Amino acid sequence: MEFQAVVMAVGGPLLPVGNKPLIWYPLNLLERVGFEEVIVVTTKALCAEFKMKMKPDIVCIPDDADMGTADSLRYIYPKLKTDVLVLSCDLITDVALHEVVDLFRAYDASLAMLMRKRDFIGVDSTGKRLLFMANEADLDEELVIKGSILQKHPRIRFHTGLVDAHLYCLKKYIVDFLMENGSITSIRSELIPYLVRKQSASSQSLDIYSFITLNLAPYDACWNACRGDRWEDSSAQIVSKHLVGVDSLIGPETQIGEKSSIKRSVIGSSCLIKDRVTITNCLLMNSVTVEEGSNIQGSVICNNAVIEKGADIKDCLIGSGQRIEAKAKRVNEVIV
Amino acid sequence: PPLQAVLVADSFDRRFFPISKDQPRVLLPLANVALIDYTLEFLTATGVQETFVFCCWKAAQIKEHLLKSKWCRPTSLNVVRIITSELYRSLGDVLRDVDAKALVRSDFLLVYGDVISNINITRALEEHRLRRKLEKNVSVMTMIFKESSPSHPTRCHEDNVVVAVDSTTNRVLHFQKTQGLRRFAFPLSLFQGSSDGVEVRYDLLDCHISICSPQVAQLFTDNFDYQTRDDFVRGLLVNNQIHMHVTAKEYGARVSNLHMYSAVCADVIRRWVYPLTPEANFTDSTTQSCTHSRHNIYRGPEVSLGHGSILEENVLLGSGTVIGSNCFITNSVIGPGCHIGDNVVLDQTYLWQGVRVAAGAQIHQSLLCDNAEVKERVTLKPRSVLTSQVVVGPNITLPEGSVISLHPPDAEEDEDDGEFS
């Protein structure tokens, strides 16, 4: 058991959750032996939001709000006995967690990404090694191609929106030879120091590889776009014998009245309707309720939402926690 | 739809000197036959009945040389359109003539008289024609231009081409040349339009081949600010997009400088262009019919080999030739009538008509011309050129560069011959 895994915190963590953060297709695919050398460093209250996710062992250490990813590794660098598998908590993807770290051993990358089809990524012929990635924070002029990249690799597929998954596999070689060179923070923007060609990291070529997946969408920090709409594997709940949901995320101990059926919807724990909860296409979170006339159609009913007795709201981020009784909310998002 | 072509002689962004004085830039005998016959049997190799060759330079010469071919008479599938020397400058007034005289319906081949190749062109011709029929004539042309490496003798830095292009629907983006640039930069505004991706390709050498349907007569005579084809297609690529096809096997390249003369004269006998290989006797020249033999030598008729003259790679002789003893000749061509005497060492000599070499003479990496009584110990080195009746003597040696002739200002020589410096 050598190479270890760590969890990050933020970007732009646990916001769009009805009842469960469905990071479970990570934690159902490869946790039989699995996933033992894992470290929680995320958003003391952080030691109480993962006693429900059935992990075998854990290391829950806090880092400060100024989340330099490089500072997040500088804090627990000595307890990195071996290599790093940074998988942030800002992740939902179902993709196969073995081949994404089997391309880690192809020509043994010092650093291995995983991306998914403005923010450019270049790549070689065979979809194996990315050469330079770039976002707009280093390009006000267009882009530069050097001599040697083109004089050696003549066929270069470019990309411009092939968005990240945040699966970074990582070898201790470059974190030694770049960590103490403190002028490179932001490990997402450390990839622009690939630092390979004739231009320190290579402290003496370097190996980097990514895998372009083709199955799910990217991670979500504050969406639940297809994450409330994520087919988890109803599962174990109870109903008023008529909750016809579209395999719907029914949080159990629900207070169903007359045909409360939040179809295509995350009806969370105590997702109460004393009347017809119809197909919401929404997410009615924990301790949220549209009772006695559920007008449930697209209204994002977030953490302890309150809109009921004609919950007139659609196509918006509806009221997250704020008490709005006769909420005639609109296409614009309801108040915080 | 019948298939014709125009065949320009010479773009005067000039690189040939002083060989373009008595004979032209286009009657350049690569293996003892005129280069017009090589490019013309490229145009007869693929199927084109009628083509237009334009002449500007001493109509008496090309007139007389086109009086003794066998497609002088249209018994074969060609007769040749030739015209005489009024106001002609370069390809500019050629295309202004071809839409003023208006000898064009659709889809003709634009080649210089300076490309030798073996592309049977018709494949991408019909793919281009499908692209015309299907999509409303937004695609102007299609250029076919080779796949190669970043390292080749034909991709010397004068016509080095990088293009950026998609690979699904193969329409180009940047025709950015590289005569001296080494940092590369592509304007990023045209990558958000194709977010699935876009390749870049450097595996290219331009065959100077491409087809043209007379939309470009409109986009050429309207826009006077384009004259050569390169700034033309860049102006096409800034405003009508133009397409691309990457051929896989067969090739040709334009014999621009003498660097390409060396590479092509060492490739027709390394034989990368068969059917073209000069045993075929394209002319009715019984003074050219030569006999192939093992390891690519080509003895002429009444060859008169010198005793012990060993031959290894890619040589010739001519008719009426007398070669002397002790010749270690490799990768060369020799011309007819040559009284090349005894103990004359050669290596990649490109010797032409009427020469009589004197005995005991290394010659190396040279190309020389008619009626040259060359004499003792004229040792040379790469990129050396003698030309047209000037006579050197007992070891007037020459270094790397040699712009010499018999004419006074271009040469390194006055009125008389090069006997004394």
Add this chain to the structure above:
Amino acid sequence: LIVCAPMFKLSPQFPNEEDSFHKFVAPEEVLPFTEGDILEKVSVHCPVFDYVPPELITLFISNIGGNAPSYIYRLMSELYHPDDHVL
């Protein structure tokens, strides 16, 4: 070795008249243009046609029937008048 050999594609020729007994084609069949910097010097060659000894094949499947691989002179006594085989 049974040779398949119709009676028209017989030749009264010999290996000796000149060369181009074989046929040399463009050798981009055996090399690509995707190598790097190598192909400047290695002088490639290929025929498409080889030459086989008469004395090793076994019999004809021919349009008279079978023949021994060195019987052929009787057929070439008949079919071609050899004073104008040289023509």
Add this chain to the structure above:
Amino acid sequence: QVPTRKDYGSKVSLFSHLPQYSRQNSLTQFMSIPSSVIHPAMVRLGLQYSQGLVSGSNARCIALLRALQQVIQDYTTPPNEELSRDLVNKLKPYMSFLTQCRPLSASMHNAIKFLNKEITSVGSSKREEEAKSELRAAIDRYVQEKIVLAAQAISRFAYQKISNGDVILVYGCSSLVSRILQEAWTEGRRFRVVVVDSRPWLEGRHTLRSLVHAGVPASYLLIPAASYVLPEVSKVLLGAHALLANGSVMSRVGTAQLALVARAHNVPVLVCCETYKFCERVQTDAFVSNELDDPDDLQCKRGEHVALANWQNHASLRLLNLVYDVTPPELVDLVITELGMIPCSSVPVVLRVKSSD
């Protein structure tokens, strides 16, 4: 514990014996990636073997031995246990793991019987640290003296061998005929070298790159046309993956007819195999035990006309490609190794001498 790798595609009519693999899946597709009972250096080895990037003659050897260096020199011991007899039984799952990842060549069997005998030699009298250090010592000596010293020794002896004016053909897939021909040239001979090869790996690539970067004259051709290289060639060289107890030349498949059509001019062979590679295994001819790669490495390319695109649409229109080949010891004339030039059938006593005797 270790799962299987299944068949890919219709197996050939003869080989029920040796199973078929393909590289568009892995054996690591099944197994848990925190490598709990199998060790990451072995799986690095098998997963890089799966792509055929290290496929050379001695390269599989040196990759295995340096791998098992980093295997045995980071091991932690068990308590209440016999120390040297905890090990070679524990090696069996890893070596069967390599077996199931890709089946072994002769060099790898030399290696496994080597450390088998030496773990069996180095007993349990001492603490594990200098035992591990002497393992490092023995294995470093092993690759050092055998590979490197064999290399320079046969360089000298074949330099003594090779004669001027002699246009020699090769068939190049080793790390050794390139070496032999480089420092045959570096002392200033005059030879002119033609290489010949064939699909699927097309190993005229590696030795053209070495030789053309070493600056030698040439001319290229390939194996069906190798009877145009009858009449004016006066030597021939061939590096083999193994020579066995008969004098059997065992290598890639393009090894066989070159010698015999050369023997149709009496210009005889020279095999360059140093004495690491030899083995006690004997097989008489070409089918009893070879390996076989991913069978879809065979497709020609004529534009779009891929002639063998899907070979499963008819129920049996089907291919396989074998990797090893053995001509009988009648026609091979010379071997070149550390102990001189051994003419052919007298090889197994050269095998015998280095066997703890």
Add this chain to the structure above:
Amino acid sequence: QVPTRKDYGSKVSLFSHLPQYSRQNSLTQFMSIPSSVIHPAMVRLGLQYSQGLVSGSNARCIALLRALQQVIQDYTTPPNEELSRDLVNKLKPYMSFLTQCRPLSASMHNAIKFLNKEITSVGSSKREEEAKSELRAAIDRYVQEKIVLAAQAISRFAYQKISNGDVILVYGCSSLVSRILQEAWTEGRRFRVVVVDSRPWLEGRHTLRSLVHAGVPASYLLIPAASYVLPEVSKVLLGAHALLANGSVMSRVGTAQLALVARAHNVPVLVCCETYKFCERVQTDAFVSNELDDPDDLQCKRGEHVALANWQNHASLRLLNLVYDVTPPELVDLVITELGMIPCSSVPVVLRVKSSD
């Protein structure tokens, strides 16, 4: 016209283009036993072939010749079907019948072609009976001139060839090799002839008995130990049935390997086939057009504990035996025929100068 003979036991996996028989059940278990569906001489020659009664060299030719002469010289000439062309097509059940019985020697094919060509040579314009007698005169002068005048012509020529003390061998069953032996012996000569034979015919008997009754010293060894005549043979007479147009010859199981073991010494093989035996069918391998006799005739007499009685009880065992064979034209050098002593590869040029030109 005729049914076919059933199979007996099992067969090898290879020879399923070849039928096998038994002589425990034959053709005329069932068919029209007063023979008028087919001419009587045909079922006569057929069921005496089924017990091998005429199994000779040109004895088989003359047996079918007497059968077909008893066909033709009592033949009713029907109207409404033509003078000469109801014979040959009604003769198609004759040789298809004998092909069903036990297949043809190529001598009988040459007989078929000659009487074919001659019954075409007499068409319609002559009355059927004296045309039938001219057919008798043609077939009698044919078999007389070719068979008999060829036998005495090669007797005079091989009497000029063979000299004193020439110890010559036969694989003996014919009426030409023992013929040349006796009528070379009785003219003041001396040569110790040895016969060789083979299981299961065990036939040398006609030749050795006719030699000893002609008074010639004989020896005897069977081809399963034919490597003991290996040094001492001075020349060898090979009795071949047919002689193809490769230059090959054509005879039994036991001229297969003596031909090669006596090419392996430069002892010049000498085959005896007259002008009658020059055929036109040309085979190359040894399983193509080769018969297969009754496959349960190879048993052993070891008291009573025979291994091959109830061989159908257990699953997969088989039997087989070939009968004819072809030797390549490398080995065979000299044929014994009329116009001279023509060599091997120049045979069919004689076959065109007696083929109506």
